[PDB]
């Protein structure tokens, strides 16, 4: 029973997306892929993945397509191994699905090798220490929670806070000039978002159809059944692993949204005879996510910079899924709806974010000291806000009001217009250098700009843009005064 390739079985049960298969010669190994060859009148092929063994002959499986028009006792044939996806530079500039089949209608892809989507995670000895700052061109991220090359980044947020927008900005700022390759994995998200991404990448020449592309797309979206949404992440991760190990390149891995991977497995968990855990997730929530996350790491052969978007259901960060993902990250960016409702974008709550490289040994001492002072001031400002509502701004001492005035400028100075949100904002985006951000905040803390109007820091880039906006504000104010004077 070593080689199960071509082994035959018969469908025994069909309930939703879960199918039970009976093999007379013994069920193949778990995670094996099966094709339902018997022609059932379907417009699309049907493939199954074994997840459990009910006995020596019966095996439970999840389908990757809809189980429509599927009858009992239909003929199943094993593929002789797990689900395989093409790898190599020939996949660049292309779009794939969970099964590794191109869906761009752009002709056959020349594949020299295929790899299984299920692989063992790197061991402890295969871990590389890479502590280097990644400049995203964003004031908030570069200052409070700087990102590390070869590390893991999470964007925790609710619905409508700007998780997808930030990913687009990061791609525009980090991927266009990236030396290596990029892999984008759409998981249980809107299909139109992927289309807009594909158009933008072609315009930015990341995907050069006539020339050489430098990115791959793998899409399993909401429309797809839960079986596909529970494996698309593995497929894209497999492609990145190949680029990391075989090609020895530094690769970017964007995932949106990783929560859907957990959600899909929960949907099928009920039909697999597993008692639900708290809230209603599957009992295997932590383990399944851990195996995937550990594969997303930088080893001694190559480096993977991973950016993952996490959906916090109903803005409840205590939910098991968001919480379980916090320990598998090197830099967490927590977005808050209240901040967005105040017109601040990106709606980052610096008090809740964290970064591993926020240590003087890794980053410059000035960078570390400035960030901590900003955080302390924001923390103190929030405490004062409680007083300001009960007593009023008048009661605050001279020192307190200075903190209030400076802190408000910090809150507004953290906002930044992105180059991808011009339609949303109506203004050109800015790319702030790391040094400019540190200097700009350092001067603000010590009062170098106490006389600048507060609104001059709202939706601007570096300090230079602040001064220009202040000058423009002064000019318009003078014009209004002149108009009033004539009256």
């Amino acid at each position: 029973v070593a080689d199960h390739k071509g082994r035959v079985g018969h469908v025994s049960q069909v309930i939703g997306a879960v199918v039970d298969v009976h093999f007379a010669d013994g069920v193949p190994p778990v995670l094996t892929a099966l094709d339902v060859v018997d022609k059932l009148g379907r417009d699309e092929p049907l493939t199954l993945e074994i997840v459990q063994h009910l006995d020596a002959h019966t095996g439970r499986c999840i389908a990757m397509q809809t189980t429509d028009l599927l009858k009992l006792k239909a003929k199943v044939v094993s593929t002789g191994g797990n689900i395989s996806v093409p790898v190599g530079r020939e996949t660049l500039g292309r779009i794939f699905n969970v099964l590794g089949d191109a869906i761009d209608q752009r002709g056959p892809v020349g594949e020299k090798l295929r790899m299984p989507i299920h692989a063992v995670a790197p061991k402890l000895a295969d871990q590389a220490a890479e502590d280097a700052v990644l400049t995203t061109g964003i004031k908030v991220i570069d200052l409070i929670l700087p990102y590390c090359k070869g590390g893991k980044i999470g964007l925790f947020g609710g619905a409508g806070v700007g998780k997808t927008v930030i990913i687009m900005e990061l791609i525009n700022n980090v991927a266009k000039g990236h030396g290596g390759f990029s892999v984008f994995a759409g998981v249980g998200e809107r299909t139109r978002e992927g289309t807009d991404l594909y158009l933008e990448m072609m315009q930015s020449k990341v995907i050069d159809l006539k020339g050489e592309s430098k990115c791959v797309l793998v899409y399993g979206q909401m429309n797809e059944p839960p079986g596909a949404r529970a494996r698309v992440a593995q497929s894209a991760l497999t492609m990145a692993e190949y680029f990391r190990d075989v090609e020895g390149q530094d690769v970017l891995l964007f995932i949106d949204n990783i929560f859907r991977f957990t959600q899909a497995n929960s949907e099928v968990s009920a039909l697999l005879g597993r008692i639900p855990a708290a809230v209603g997730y599957q009992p295997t929530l932590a383990e399944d996510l851990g195996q995937l996350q550990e594969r997303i790491t930088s080893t001694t052969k190559g480096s993977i910079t991973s950016v993952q978007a996490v959906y916090v259901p109903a803005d409840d960060i205590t939910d098991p899924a968001p919480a379980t993902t916090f320990s598998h990250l090197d830099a967490t960016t927590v977005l808050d709806r209240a901040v967005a409702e105040s017109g601040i974008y990106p709606a980052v709550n610096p008090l809740e974010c964290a970064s591993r490289i926020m240590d003087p040994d890794v980053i410059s001492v000035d960078h570390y000291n400035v960030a901590q002072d900003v955080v302390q001031m924001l923390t103190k400002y929030r405490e004062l806000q409680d007083i300001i509502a009960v007593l009023g701004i008048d009661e605050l001492s001279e020192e307190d009001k200075l903190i209030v005035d400076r802190a408000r400028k910090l809150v507004k100075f953290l906002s930044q217009p992105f180059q991808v949100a011009e339609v949303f904002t109506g203004m050109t985006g800015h790319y702030v250098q790391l040094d400019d951000t540190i200097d700009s905040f350092s001067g603000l803390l010590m009062g170098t700009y106490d006389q600048v109007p507060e609104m001059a820091f709202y939706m601007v880039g570096g300090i230079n843009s602040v001064l220009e906006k202040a000058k423009k504000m002064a000019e318009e104010a003078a014009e209004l005064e002149k108009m009033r004077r004539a009256r």
Partner: protein, 166 residues
């Protein structure tokens, strides 16, 4: 001559001559839109010539359909067609398209729309056909003398409590 490509890089059919002939054989101008629909389905995006033919059919057609349609207006349909062409297709209307609009305004007696179209041709295009400008002014003179320059209910004197707010 030169292959055109769509948004995603796929090529689009450019031989749009047969469809124009079909358009020029319609009786009611609503049927013309059906031809444009078929062209789009067949990945044969209309060109400037196709839109002009559609405008010609609208001007020369008796009515929108075999049966009357309430509040139907040839001018509104043509303007909407131009809006689609310039905005959702990125094609600049030529002199021919605007002339058809001006002819419809003159034919329909809408002398106020003719003034606006007259400036449009004088602004984007090079002037207006002086034959139509004079005709439009002539239409204005007729109701200028007939006591129908402005609907009368508009001109009725009213007051704070003399207006019926339906």
């Amino acid at each position: 001559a030169a292959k055109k490509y769509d948004l995603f890089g796929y090529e689009v059919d450019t031989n749009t001559a047969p469809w124009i002939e079909k358009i020029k054989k319609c009786k009611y101008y609503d049927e013309a839109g059906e031809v444009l629909v078929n062209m789009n389905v067949s990945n044969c995006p209309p060109d400037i010539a196709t839109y002009n033919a559609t405008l010609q059919c609208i001007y020369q057609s008796p009515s929108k359909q075999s049966t009357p349609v309430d509040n139907e207006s040839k001018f509104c349909a043509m303007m909407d067609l131009l809006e689609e062409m310039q905005h959702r297709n990125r094609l600049k209307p030529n002199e021919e398209s605007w002339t058809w609009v001006m002819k419809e305004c003159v034919k329909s007696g809408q002398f106020r729309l003719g003034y606006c179209i007259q400036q449009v041709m004088e602004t984007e295009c090079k002037g207006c056909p002086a034959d139509l400008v004079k005709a439009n002014e002539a239409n204005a003179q007729k109701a200028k003398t007939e006591g129908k320059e402005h609907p009368g209910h508009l001109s009725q004197q009213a007051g704070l409590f003399d207006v019926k707010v339906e």
